[PDB]
Design a protein around this ligand. Structure first.
Ligand SMILES: N[C@@H](CCC(=O)N[C@@H](CS)C(=O)NCC(=O)O)C(=O)O
Ligand SMILES: N[C@@H](CCC(=O)N[C@@H](CS)C(=O)NCC(=O)O)C(=O)O
Ligand SMILES: C=C(CC)C(=O)c1ccc(OCC(=O)O)c(Cl)c1Cl
Ligand SMILES: C=C(CC)C(=O)c1ccc(OCC(=O)O)c(Cl)c1Cl
Lengths: 221, 221
């Protein structure tokens, strides 16, 4: 029927976690790229964006805005949000930790040059002493293949996506965390995820200086 | 039985929305205040904070950290998160908008003096031209007393809490939004909320330079 339609600019940004989740669920989607501020304004004027911002996803008759709203709906619709509220609580706690670290890395390129060095150092420190030990500890606690309920959930998907970004940053960071390395492997081999990691998929590359300045002009940041 | 126990410092911060939610649901809770950095370190060493941070809420045998994880659990447990996946999607979209504006106002006090004047102007502009019209439009669209499903939800609670903060900032901002003003009144009269607004409740006052000074030392911000 109507495949979900993602509205954003041709880049990772705040739309990438959604592309990863849909793909891992095996859902085909279409993207409608915003190429100019004129494109954004038309969406605004047609009353498509509740808060005049993107990401925006057309799905099940709704024009959903706000990253967490979009991700929560999709995760629930495809049974990737756990089996009950206690499982959702563990999932939420884990993925909000992932969102904090992920945001830091996302904004690194937009960080003021005189601060870049400090920021990068703080991030690596947090990765090694706060975030990775926390997730490695969860996996060691139950010895299971998945983070929550011994079954695949959005938590494993979001985590593995973040592990790829950390690798791009510094591949040595994951060294002292074997369980995390193991999970990265298992999840990457699931048919849906393997197809998404392969050349030619909707997966997006890191942002280049040239494309980054047009984005900044359109969105103002 | 065991009442929920909230761990934070004596101030609004990121714990205030949880205080407002529990109270609106009629749930009594206890607070354990962090008075010094040594208090924070004890929690850390006791293995109570997954990511070495607070807010942390002890509830139903769990040591839940992360604001959204805590609020999602509580909203679900007390039937304040809608009746289905689609109602939850509208709620999430709305409250994520509230979270964005709320974060701006929360951080205003820790903003550079040089920047404050430009910041606050940006906020008031967003309030009048982005956020308030969006919510006023939702209420006008259905003509109902609540934001979603013609039944009280966490969305009405989060919104009214935000209206009080905007009032503290500039009481004239809500002027051209009659429906928002009406909602503020209606929600404030609910028994549980009215009791929370009264003197002596766990509701917290805005921050003062001395206390802000110390929060900053402890939390390093
Ligand atoms: N909290 C929102 C933030 C959305 C957001 O910041 N969107 C940006 C681009 S990534 C945008 O459209 N900015 C245009 C504007 O703010 O006018 C979310 O998570 O979706
Ligand atoms: N995204 C987290 C942020 C938590 C947070 O920023 N906690 C601060 C105090 S408000 C803290 O404990 N900082 C100490 C630290 O980061 O080491 C949440 O929503 O709970
Ligand atoms: C809303 C925007 C800024 C707050 C945003 O989501 C964003 C973040 C990083 C970005 O580049 C880096 C990348 O890897 O995509 C880009 Cl192009 C965007 Cl639009
Ligand atoms: C994590 C902290 C900041 C990164 C935080 O949540 C926070 C924000 C504002 C604050 O003061 C303002 C207030 O009105 O409470 C305080 Cl005291 C805190 Cl601890």
């Amino acid at each position: 029927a109507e495949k979900p339609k993602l509205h954003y600019f041709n880049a990772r940004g705040k739309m990438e976690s959604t592309r990863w989740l849909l793909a891992a669920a095996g859902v085909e989607f279409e993207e409608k790229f915003i190429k100019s501020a004129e494109d954004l304004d038309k969406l605004r004027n047609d009353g498509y964006l509740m808060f005049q911002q993107v990401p925006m996803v057309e799905i099940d008759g709704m024009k959903l805005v706000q990253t967490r709203a979009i991700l929560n709906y999709i995760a629930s619709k495809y049974n990737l949000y756990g089996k009950d509220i206690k499982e959702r609580a563990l999932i939420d706690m884990y993925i909000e930790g992932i969102a904090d670290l992920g945001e830091m890395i996302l904004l690194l390129p937009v960080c003021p040059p005189e601060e870049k060095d400090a920021k990068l150092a703080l991030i690596k420190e947090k990765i090694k002493n706060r975030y990775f030990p926390a997730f490695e500890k969860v996996l060691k606690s139950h010895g299971q293949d998945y983070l929550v309920g011994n079954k695949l959930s959005r938590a494993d998907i979001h985590l593995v996506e973040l592990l790829y970004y950390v690798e791009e940053l510094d591949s040595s960071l994951i060294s002292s965390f074997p369980l995390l390395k193991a999970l990265k492997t298992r999840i990457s081999n699931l048919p849906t995820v393997k197809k998404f990691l392969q050349p030619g998929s909707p997966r997006k590359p890191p942002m280049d200086e040239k494309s980054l300045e047009e984005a900044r002009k359109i969105f103002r940041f």
